[PDB]
Subunit: 134 residues, 2 copies
């Protein structure tokens, strides 16, 4: 029930990571909702034309990050989103990534004003439009 | 002539990358200036107590990114900073890293307001204070 998406084989991001990040973004958009059943590893691999082992790797990483949950013989679902406590360690690691990225941009001559602008643009692209039912 | 710095062996960043990023940050701060001679690989490894091969790896990456320049038999220097053209490919890759990092934070429940705040804080920490001579 995930929406199909673009995969870029020349990206710096491995295919499995692209899958992880697109699923995450779709949850952020509300395109995928808590409890929603998504495609099985094999169904998904078959549909997008990707190595099933690559999709398995992505789903394992998604479950590790608690984005999805697998219930044996029942399927794979989007995990609890409402009252989840974000992993402090993941938050810490992600803040470090933000810091390092800002250092890289600043070194390359991008000023903080331009960085705020980019952050707004990317934030808006991630949040997307709006999805409803009924 | 680089300033000594903290290395965190439990960081998600490999030691060589920590060295690359600290040198870059010191250039951003003006602690290291264009043309300034820095420690040789062996001098630096000896001083910080790191594997010389790790320092060599960092210096290779710094030269790849055009942060430093090595002149055979003369030493290693901070590369041109004034009229350098930032690699469009590196800029593009770094912008992608910003986007992915923002997605990760937003997924973890950090709002764009908090992200702008973090960006300002990290930007200020990178820029640092002020270094002069005379």
């Amino acid at each position: 029930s995930n929406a199909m998406f673009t995969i870029n084989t020349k990206s710096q991001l491995p295919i499995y990571e692209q899958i992880v990040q697109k699923i995450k973004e779709q949850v952020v958009k509300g395109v995928l909702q808590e409890g929603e059943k998504i495609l099985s590893i094999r169904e998904f691999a078959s549909r997008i034309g990707v190595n099933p082992n690559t999709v398995s790797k992505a789903y394992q990483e998604l479950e590790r990050q608690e984005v999805i949950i697998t219930v044996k013989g029942k399927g794979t679902f989007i995990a609890n989103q409402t009252d989840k406590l974000s992993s402090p360690k993941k938050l810490a690691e992600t803040r470090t990534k933000l810091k390092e990225t800002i250092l890289d941009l600043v070194y390359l001559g991008v000023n903080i004003e331009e960085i705020h602008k980019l952050a707004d643009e990317y934030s808006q692209d991630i949040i997307g439009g709006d999805v409803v039912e009924g």
